[PDB]
A paper describes a structure:
Here, we describe a rhodopsin group found in microorganisms from cold environments, such as glaciers, denoted as CryoRhodopsins (CryoRs). A distinguishing feature of the group is the presence of a buried arginine residue close to the cytoplasmic face. Combining single-particle cryo–electron microscopy and x-ray crystallography with rhodopsin activation by light, we demonstrate that the arginine stabilizes an ultraviolet (UV)–absorbing intermediate of an extremely slow CryoRhodopsin photocycle. Our data suggest that CryoRs are sensors for UV irradiation and are also capable of inward proton translocation modulated by UV light.
AK-R2A1-2, GenBank ID: UFS59673.1), RRETEDK (CryoR3, Cryobacterium frigoriphilum, GenBank ID: WP_166791776), RRDNEDK (CryoR4, Subtercola vilae, UniProt ID: A0A4T2CD69), and RRDTEDK (CryoR5, Subtercola boreus, UniProt ID: A0A3E0VLV3). The transmembrane part is mostly hydrophobic and occupied by lipid molecules as evidenced in the (electron) density maps but has a narrow polar region near the W40 and R43 residues in CryoR1 (Y41 and R44 in CryoR2), which, to some extent, resembles that of the pentameric viral rhodopsin OLPVRII. Next, the cytoplasmic part of the pore in CryoRs has an additional second narrowing formed by the C-terminal residues I238 and E287 in CryoR1 and CryoR2, respectively. In the RSB region of both CryoR1 and CryoR2 up to the arginine residue at the extracellular side (R99/R100 in CryoR1/CryoR2; analog of R82 in BR), there are also no internal water molecules. At the extracellular side of CryoRs, we found a large water-filled cavity, between R99/R100 (in CryoR1/CryoR2; analog of R82 in BR) and the small (single turn) N-terminal α helix, capping the internal space of the CryoR protomer from the extracellular bulk. Our structural data show that in both CryoR1 and CryoR2, the arginine likely plays a triple role. Second, the arginine decreases the pKa of a conserved glutamic acid at the cytoplasmic side (E113/E114 in CryoR1/CryoR2). In that case, R58 (analog of R57 in CryoR1) forms a salt bridge with E114 (analog of E113 in CryoR1) in the ground and M2 states of CryoR2 in almost identical manner to those shown for CryoR1. Thus, structural data on CryoR1 and CryoR2 allow us to conclude that the reorientation of the characteristic unique arginine at the cytoplasmic side of CryoRs in the long-living blue-shifted state is likely a feature of the entire clade.
Author numbering:
A (entry chain A), B (entry chain E), C (entry chain D), D (entry chain C), E (entry chain B): 5 to 286
Amino acid sequence: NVSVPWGATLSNAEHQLIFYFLVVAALAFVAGFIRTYITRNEVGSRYRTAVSARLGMLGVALLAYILIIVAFLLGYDSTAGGWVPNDGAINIFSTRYIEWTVSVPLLTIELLAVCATLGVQARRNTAIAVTATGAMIFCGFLGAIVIDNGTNTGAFILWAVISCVFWVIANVVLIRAVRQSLPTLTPESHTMLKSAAIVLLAGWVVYPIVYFLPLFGASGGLTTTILITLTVADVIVKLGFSTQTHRVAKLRTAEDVRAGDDVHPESIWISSVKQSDAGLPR
Amino acid sequence: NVSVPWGATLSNAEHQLIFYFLVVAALAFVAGFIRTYITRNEVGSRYRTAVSARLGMLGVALLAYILIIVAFLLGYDSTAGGWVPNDGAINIFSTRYIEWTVSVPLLTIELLAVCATLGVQARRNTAIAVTATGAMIFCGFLGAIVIDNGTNTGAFILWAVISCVFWVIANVVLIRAVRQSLPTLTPESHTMLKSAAIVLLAGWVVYPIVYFLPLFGASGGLTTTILITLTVADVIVKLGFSTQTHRVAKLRTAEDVRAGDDVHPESIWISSVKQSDAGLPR
Amino acid sequence: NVSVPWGATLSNAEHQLIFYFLVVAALAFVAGFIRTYITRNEVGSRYRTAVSARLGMLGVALLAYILIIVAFLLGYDSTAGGWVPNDGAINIFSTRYIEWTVSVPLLTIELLAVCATLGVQARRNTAIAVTATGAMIFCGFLGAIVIDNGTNTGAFILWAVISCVFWVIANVVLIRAVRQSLPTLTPESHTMLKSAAIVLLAGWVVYPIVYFLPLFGASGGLTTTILITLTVADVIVKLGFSTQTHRVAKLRTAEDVRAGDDVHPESIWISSVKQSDAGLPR
Amino acid sequence: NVSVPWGATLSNAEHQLIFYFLVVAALAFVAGFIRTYITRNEVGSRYRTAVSARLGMLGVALLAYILIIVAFLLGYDSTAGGWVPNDGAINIFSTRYIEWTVSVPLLTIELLAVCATLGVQARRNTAIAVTATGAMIFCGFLGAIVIDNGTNTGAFILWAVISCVFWVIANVVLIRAVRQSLPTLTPESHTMLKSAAIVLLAGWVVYPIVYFLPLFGASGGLTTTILITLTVADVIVKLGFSTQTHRVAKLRTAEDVRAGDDVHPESIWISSVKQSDAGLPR
Amino acid sequence: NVSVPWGATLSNAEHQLIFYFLVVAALAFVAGFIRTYITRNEVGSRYRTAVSARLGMLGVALLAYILIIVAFLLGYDSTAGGWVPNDGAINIFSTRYIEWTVSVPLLTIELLAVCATLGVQARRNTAIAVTATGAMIFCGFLGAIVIDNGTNTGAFILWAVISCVFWVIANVVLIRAVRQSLPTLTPESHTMLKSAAIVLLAGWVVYPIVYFLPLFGASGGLTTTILITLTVADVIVKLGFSTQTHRVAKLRTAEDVRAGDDVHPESIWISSVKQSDAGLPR
Ligand SMILES: *C\C=C(C)/C=C/C=C(C)/C=C/C1=C(C)CCCC1(C)C
Ligand SMILES: *C\C=C(C)/C=C/C=C(C)/C=C/C1=C(C)CCCC1(C)C
Ligand SMILES: *C\C=C(C)/C=C/C=C(C)/C=C/C1=C(C)CCCC1(C)C
Ligand SMILES: *C\C=C(C)/C=C/C=C(C)/C=C/C1=C(C)CCCC1(C)C
Ligand SMILES: *C\C=C(C)/C=C/C=C(C)/C=C/C1=C(C)CCCC1(C)C
């Protein structure tokens, strides 16, 4: 059966670890937001979407993680028997689905931004991906939170299945876009995009796995394993992979500048190598 | 007869779904605000008003949606019989009228900003539209919230009628402005404006319809349908259509640059096609 | 006698209307703040003071209106007999005097910024105006709030009289500055300043009138009329007239650019007419 | 004996006046912060420290004054016998010492920034001044707040004496720096610095005087006089004198530009006279 | 044996001093954040990482210190017997470990940013350092907070030992990077980096020492000594040493500009000496 994670009483260790990771995440996102803002003009206007998506995703994550922290502080009470969940502990689990609903479509927008697609294909791509990913999150939220208060095993499973269909649709769309890109890019750029895609699409699998952990039992330790693992995953994907597309966009900006297709006000540096020189509109 | 939406007790599913959409909206607006800010200089000084209106509308929406979220958390209490409305549940419904009062006039300002009107006509247009739209919202607020606490069917209806007159005035003004524009623009620009207008003016109809749903009865289902539908509509219109005028303004900037009427510091890209090159004041 | 406004019990309609206007104001100011910030570089460095004053005034208004909203939510308690003022309701009335104390001197700074005055006269002007206006607000605050808790009719009147002397001093100073300007400006600029002054100085009269309403009796109606009217006045003067000086400053920037006295990085547009072209320091 | 200021019960007038000045200060600082930010690029990179110090000081003041306002609202309760101090009223007095601890060293940094000192002397100057001033504040905090809860007359006095030694050290350092500057500046610049120093160093005396007013007795009148006087002093020194160094820095920037030692992207204006023209790096 | 710091009752002096330092820190960080932001463009794009890391670290510190202040206000209750720790007092100690978890890896990123390393070595360096330092903090958090609620002496010690291994790894990595840099830099730059490294790595020792103070007993004195000393250390290292790398980055920018390897829009000043002139992309 499904044993909802927010039913469990947390040990002190457990409650302490959760607060640590939750706040470390929020602070890492603040740092990431600052970095992304300070470096927004390393990218040409042609790829500004990549930058905006990413800065958006980091802002969203930062706010969502503030809510999660509030929900956590207002969701358990120390009672000699550790910390006992109140009726707002479900909101620690809900807010995360909230956050993914915005953030994951932003990720698709970012990745498509640095691909080589034009016109209808590019608008079709962005429509299907943003749709399929928000649907994928919402189906999850249905199974895990909304129907029967999380407790209906058949709902819980069936909605995860539906969710997995939207997950395959999103991937196919993205994977195809990245692989219609690669023929038109330069070796260095081809490589960079291929690698960014993989990094950006591979760690999605974590989420579905964590989703099904409520099936193996209910414990404060299982709850801590769920909340922590999701927090780490979010930091790795949103923060850790926040520079993959930035490097792609920078190396693309620089190639345009070297081809005389554009100019850029400052030199561009990637891995401490100069990619392009500063130049003025001539 | 009118059954006010804030009278109904919400199931857990219902209360969970509402919080989801409300917060997803707030987070989508934060993302939108960041995008609009990061891309404010893609537009020439001639059309900066379009940008400011839009960035204003997104900032307003973001704050309004924070209030709505507060009002929601402070408006229902879990009581075994789901969530029971308290005396601040009306403020969940009131805050939205508040938000439209600023946001809808901002929308009119934005659309007129990218039209081809000069002098008195342009000042008359903006005066009538900003007036007619704020009046339209306020009449709504009267019928639905203020008179008799929402419960007077004849008020509720009569004020919606008055509201619909201000709605026709606004449309006529706007529609005429857009159609005095189109003769002077270029094919590509003509098309773009025509389409932006339609997108921007068509989904207004949703609001009046939702307004009259408190007449079909009272339920937490119905209450939930109301709050969600309004949230989706807001996201579609404020966020979804936040780029229509931006593209119009960009393509207008670029045409000036190509005509030698202006210069722009960076190249302009629309749908991954280069519209204009960067240039310096010569 | 004086019947203090914060003594009255508010109907539900009344309490609803007040919250509407108060929050609509705050949101309008957020929009205004964003506009003013986004357009700060339409003005040359010579007139940057106008811009800073205005952006300051809008920031102040936005914060003050947040306080007023708090004070309102924490100042009346629903009790079957509508909303009954607690002992913090006075703070709804006090915060507004607070706000004017900063905002009105900012207005004088803004208007003098776009006048044609040099050296001692300009420093004397700004000193007398900023003094006379802050004094004018403080005398008001004395009569209405501080002495006898607002209830002393002779105080209430006598301090309003004193306040009116500082009001005449401020006007004389300002009016003379604007009329020593006009001889040195261009027709187009002369006209623009004259008009901005009138708009900026005419709606001051509202405030003194509203000030003496507590003398015609006490009612929640009267209390509501007071709070709303002040809110509308603030929006009209701070937001509505936030572009008068901006246009003046823009047309002055542009005239310098056309005379070859300065350069400006971007073209300047006023009412959809181009005033000056972009240019580089030569 | 010392009668601590936070022991006194405040009349309604008194409590009203205090809240007025405290919030007027916070709002004035917001305005000042906005001005300083909007005008940060009127100064060359050579004197950017002056700007950063000042913008820092205004940000600090704004936050400190928000705390003081909180502390005030949470420090007295209306009890028929006016407002009666709780055991957090001391924090109204403590927060101010907190604020000076950052702000006064920032002031020294700002003033030294616009002086003509190089190498060791400049690093020695900044070290002694920042040290002596933070020490001066902390000694004050000891005598007034920490030892014996403020109530030890001999502590109170002895720590103020120590504090006055650090005050003389700071002045000597600063005064000497300003007077080793003046021989190397231009008449116009010499004059400007001399005047800025005097303005910046003269109103320090207020603070020590107010410090000893708890020795003349205890009253809500006296308590009110203390809190208001400190608030006015802060506004005069932090806000009122926030442009003295800015003018100094601007006139220094402009002189470099006129000497061909630097360039500046925009013209520089001081008192409505043009000081330097815009120019590009040649 | 370990006597947890959050067990002790604080005298009034003690509670007053702690609040002072905690808030002085937060305010110093706000000032630092403003400085770093205002001066972000003194550094070339090649070394922007240094700037972003530092601005990130200061933003993180500012938020962390706000939490610590909250935790403090909500962690002790005045009970005639001074201030008595409640059960959130542990969170005053926990939040600091939280803060170091982000901030210390940011410090390593900053220092490596201004070193002369390319390709794999630079990516290996940053990976090991960011890992080793976050591990070092987390091991600390285990021993001090999580296991046995802080009270297990053998845990407390053993985890500090493990922590010290990660501390040696981090240092070796960093020290080697800085000393593979120095052969390729200029005298002036070599010197500057060597000095920045020492300053940046030397005051790490404080933290481990303070960590083992809970072993010398329990007291409010000892508790106070701990919290203050950590606060001062943080201010010295995060704020005090926030300019070391900035100077390094500036002098490196300037050397590139003098070599004709880059251009920089503004002149660069270090210690009131001009390092490079402004220039345009040629
Ligand atoms: C914050 C960033 C990311 C990439 C979060 C991703 C979330 C998913 C990939 C969720 C997928 C789900 C599936 C496919 C099936 C079970 C329900 C889930 C929503 C967890
Ligand atoms: C937030 C964006 C938009 C466009 C909101 C629009 C609101 C309306 C178009 C409201 C119209 C009304 C009418 C015409 C009649 C009933 C009362 C309403 C206020 C709902
Ligand atoms: C927020 C903007 C404005 C211009 C507010 C203005 C306030 C006044 C002009 C107040 C004037 C007063 C007078 C002359 C006499 C009675 C007391 C008052 C303060 C209301
Ligand atoms: C916020 C700005 C300023 C300049 C505040 C200044 C504070 C002082 C100059 C304080 C001086 C003190 C002395 C010399 C002796 C008594 C203790 C004091 C801290 C009040
Ligand atoms: C906020 C800035 C800094 C540099 C903080 C540094 C923290 C450490 C160097 C901590 C080291 C530890 C060790 C090596 C052993 C005991 C556990 C500690 C985490 C305190």
